[PDB]
Amino acid sequence: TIPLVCIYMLSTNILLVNLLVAMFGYTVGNNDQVWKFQRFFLVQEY
Amino acid sequence: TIPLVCIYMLSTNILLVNLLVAMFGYTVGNNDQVWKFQRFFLVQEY
Numbered sequence: 001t002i003p004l005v006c007i008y009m010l011s012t013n014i015l016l017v018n019l020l021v022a023m024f025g026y027t028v029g030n031n032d033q034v035w036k037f038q039r040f041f042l043v044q045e046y
Numbered sequence: 047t048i049p050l051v052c053i054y055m056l057s058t059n060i061l062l063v064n065l066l067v068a069m070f071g072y073t074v075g076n077n078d079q080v081w082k083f084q085r086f087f088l089v090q091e092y
């Protein structure tokens with residue numbers, strides 16, 4: 001258990017960070033034109 | 047239990063806040079140049 005909680009302290013903080021990257025990764029990387037192209041894109045196929 | 051839930055009302059709100067600081071602390075403190083230095087940094091060692 002000297003490394004087994006350090007498994008869970010390393011399992012969390014690589015799945016937790018990947019979860020938090022998923023919540024926030026839309027922010028990094030004109031956003032009315034970036035939207036209005038995609039709103040035009042999706043409605044055009046239907 | 048007059049203080050024991052106030053333990054848990056103080057345990058949460060110091061671990062919850064430290065969790066929420068972890069989600070949001072990347073925002074505070076040029077971010078194309080701040081990235082492109084680190085993308086150059088990591089690829090250069092490999």
Ligand SMILES: CCCCCCCCCCC
Nearest residue numbers: 005008009012016019065
């Ligand atoms: C093995 C458990 C280590 C602590 C888990 C706390 C993670 C909280 C995640 C809430 C999104």
Ligand SMILES: CCCCCCCCCCC
Nearest residue numbers: 051053054055058062065
């Ligand atoms: C002792 C429990 C006190 C309430 C816990 C609610 C915290 C929700 C955290 C969700 C990230």
Ligand code: NA
Nearest residue numbers: 008011012015
């Ligand atoms: Na886990």
Ligand code: NA
Nearest residue numbers: 012015016019
């Ligand atoms: Na997790």
Ligand code: NA
Nearest residue numbers: 054057058061
């Ligand atoms: Na707690």
Ligand code: NA
Nearest residue numbers: 058061062065
């Ligand atoms: Na918590």
